[PDB]
């Protein structure tokens, strides 16, 4: 359980300088499946962030990961494109176990696939040397960030 | 390649895997204490396994070494609950992101001075990862009575 709180949203915004709501859309039912997911994780240890990259690569067509932190806390964000569609219930169980964290430490919703500022969040992230990347960029990001 | 695994282990750790373990021929026999050797393991998984095993063990001692011939990590694990080789094999292959053929598992040789001293010597290295109190069979054979 535990979707999110004013405190988790507040920390995300203080670190990434934009709302978690501006890069995702809403799935109110925990059973609806989807290949693409946006994941935010608070209080994650570095060794598990790095191990998750190698493990997700084997079941994904695309993956982009980054992390930030300051005196108030830490937050890692993932754009995941699974080879097979999964529900929030399933992804929640997979990632809490994989990352060695409580479910309350996560926030999960599918991506906002229409909107230029939303597509530029990922394009900007792909320009950092620290970002971990795997696979070909999703067409919805490529199409909105190209043509002049 | 078992003949070559054994050779790599001795080359790196200075003694034979057979001299620090005893034999369990049946993969279903359960036991709390296990000795594990892993070949070709990545560093990030070695470190992550220390944090995950602490959660279900009363004692743990781990080491990892390498050279142009290859890499090997050795573990003395004391689980809270007794487990069979089948069960430990499945657990660790998945935890470490390696094929089961990359592991060697047997219970420890609990009687013999040279075998107890392998663990005592390992505990003196600053590189060794440790958790919990040393097993009584090691403490008793390596202390002046
Ligand atoms: Br969630
Ligand atoms: Br917000
Ligand atoms: Br919506
Ligand atoms: Br829904
Ligand atoms: Br929708
Ligand atoms: Br989508
Ligand atoms: Br935090
Ligand atoms: Br949308
Ligand atoms: Br549409
Ligand atoms: Br909009
Ligand atoms: Br921008
Ligand atoms: Br797409
Ligand atoms: Br074995």
UniProtKB/Swiss-Prot annotation, chain A:
Subcellular location: Host nucleus
Subunit relationships: Can form hexamers. Interacts with E2 protein; this interaction increases E1 DNA binding specificity. Interacts with host DNA polymerase subunit POLA2. Interacts with host single stranded DNA-binding protein RPA1. Interacts with host TOP1; this interaction stimulates the enzymatic activity of TOP1.
Free-text function comment from the UniProt entry: ATP-dependent DNA 3'-5' helicase required for initiation of viral DNA replication. It forms a complex with the viral E2 protein. The E1-E2 complex binds to the replication origin which contains binding sites for both proteins. During the initial step, a dimer of E1 interacts with a dimer of protein E2 leading to a complex that binds the viral origin of replication with high specificity. Then, a second dimer of E1 displaces the E2 dimer in an ATP-dependent manner to form the E1 tetramer.
The record's account of how the chain is modified after translation: Phosphorylated.
Recorded superkingdom: Viruses
Region ranges (DNA-binding region): 4-148
Lineage of the organism: Viruses, Monodnaviria, Shotokuvirae, Cossaviricota, Papovaviricetes
Coverage span on the entire protein: 159 to 303 of 605
Family, as annotated: Belongs to the papillomaviridae E1 protein family.
Protein name, entry field: Replication protein E1
Swiss-Prot record, chain B:
Compartments, as annotated in UniProt: Host nucleus
Region (DNA-binding region): 1-145
PTM note: Phosphorylated. Sumoylated.
Disulfide-bonded cysteines: none
Signal peptide: none
Complexes and interactors: Can form hexamers. Interacts with E2 protein; this interaction increases E1 DNA binding specificity. Interacts with host DNA polymerase subunit POLA2. Interacts with host single stranded DNA-binding protein RPA1. Interacts with host TOP1; this interaction stimulates the enzymatic activity of TOP1.
Entry similarity comment: Belongs to the papillomaviridae E1 protein family.
Function: ATP-dependent DNA 3'-5' helicase required for initiation of viral DNA replication. It forms a complex with the viral E2 protein. The E1-E2 complex binds to the replication origin which contains binding sites for both proteins. During the initial step, a dimer of E1 interacts with a dimer of protein E2 leading to a complex that binds the viral origin of replication with high specificity. Then, a second dimer of E1 displaces the E2 dimer in an ATP-dependent manner to form the E1 tetramer.
Name by which UniProt lists this protein: Replication protein E1
Natural source organism: Bovine papillomavirus type 1
Gene behind this protein: E1
Full-sequence range covered: 159 to 303 of 605
């Amino acid at each position: 359980g535990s979707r999110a709180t004013v405190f988790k949203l507040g920390l995300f915004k203080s670190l990434f300088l934009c709302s978690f709501h501006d890069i995702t859309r809403l799935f109110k039912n925990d059973k609806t499946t989807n290949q693409q997911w946006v994941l935010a994780v608070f209080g994650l240890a570095e060794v598990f962030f790095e191990a998750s990259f190698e493990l997700l690569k084997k079941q994904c067509s695309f993956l982009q990961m980054q992390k930030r932190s300051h005196e108030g806390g830490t937050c890692a964000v993932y754009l995941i494109c699974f080879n097979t569609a999964k529900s929030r219930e399933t992804v929640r169980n997979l990632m809490a176990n994989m990352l060695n964290v409580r479910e309350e430490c996560l926030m999960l919703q599918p991506p906002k696939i229409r909107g230029l500022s939303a597509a530029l969040f990922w394009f900007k992230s792909s320009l950092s040397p620290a970002t971990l990347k795997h696979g070909a960029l999703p067409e919805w990001i490529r199409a909105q960030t190209t043509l002049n």
